[PDB]
Amino acid sequence: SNSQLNAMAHQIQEMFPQVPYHLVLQDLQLTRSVEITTDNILEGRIQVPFPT
Amino acid sequence: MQIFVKTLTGKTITLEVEPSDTIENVKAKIQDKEGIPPDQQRLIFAGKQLEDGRTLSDYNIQKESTLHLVLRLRGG
Amino acid sequence: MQIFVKTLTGKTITLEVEPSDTIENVKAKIQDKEGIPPDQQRLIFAGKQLEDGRTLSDYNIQKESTLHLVLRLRGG
C-alpha cells in the first residue's frame, strides 16, 4: 500500500535532514523497518548525496 | 537547559542537560527513561553523530536543541 | 496488521496477522488461499527462516513488511 512505508520514511527524513527522500522510500521496501533503515544509512547502505 | 530528543516513533523526550554534560551520560538518562540499551542508542545531530568523549559545548549545542535518536539493532 | 508475502513467481499476497500470531498459522492462512502444503511452505523474512512454532513478535515483523515464500519440491 506504501501508506506505512512512506510514513516511516517521513520520520527518518526528520532524523537525517541530508538524505534523499526518494532513496529512503526505496530502502523501506528492502528493509521494512526504521530500526534497520536509519541504522544502515550510517553504515553505508544508502548512497549519500555526492556532487556528481 | 532543556533539549528535545526525537525518536523514530515520533516521540519527543524532554531531558534536562547542561553544557558540562557528557553524551554518554545523556544516553544513560534515555536508558532509564525508555529502557533502550546504549548499544541501540545512536545520537545524531544535524546529520552527524556525537562522540561520547565530548560535551554539548563541543558541538555548540544551545538551548532547545533537537537531538535525533536513531534506533538500531544487530540481531537480524 | 497487514503483511505482504511474495512468492517466487513474483505474486504478492496480503495477509491479516498480529504479533501474537504464530508462523504455523500464517502457513495455514496461505494454505487456505493458495492451497500450498505447509510442509512445502518455506517462509523467509529478510534472511531469517521462520519456524512454525514461533510468534510473529519473535521476528519483530511490522506492517507492510515483505516476506519471501520459497517452494520446496522433491524431498521428505
Helix, strand or coil for residue A17? coil
Partners of residue C2 on adjacent β-strands = C16
Which chains pack against A, by 3+ Cβ pairs within 8 A? Answer: B, C
Chain C contacts in chain B segment 47-76 (CB below 8 A): 76
Helix, strand or coil for residue B6? strand
Question: A13, A24 in Cβ contact below 8 A?
Answer: yes
What is the nearest CA distance from A33 to chain C, expressed in angstroms?
Answer: 7
Burial class (CB in 10 A: 0-12, 13-18, 19+), B17: buried
Give C61's contacts (C-beta < 8 A, 6+ positions apart): C3, C19, C45, C67
Residue-range domain boundaries for chain B: 1-76
| Domains delineated in chain A | 1-52 (1.10.8.10)
For helices A34-43 and A3-15, what crossing angle results, to 10°? 40
Q: How far apart are CA C31 and CA B32, in angstroms?
A: 45
Q: Considering only the top CATH level, what class is B1-76?
A: alpha beta
Provide Rg for chain B, Cα atoms.
12
* Optimal mutation site among A38, A40, A41, interface B, most CBs of chain B within 10 A: A38
Q: Which cell numbers in the block locate residue A46?
A: 544508502
What is the nearest CA distance from B20 to chain A, expressed in angstroms?
Answer: 25
CA-wise closest residue to C53 among C64, C66, C67, C38:
C38
Grid look-up 556528481 returns A52
Burial class (CB in 10 A: 0-12, 13-18, 19+), C64: buried
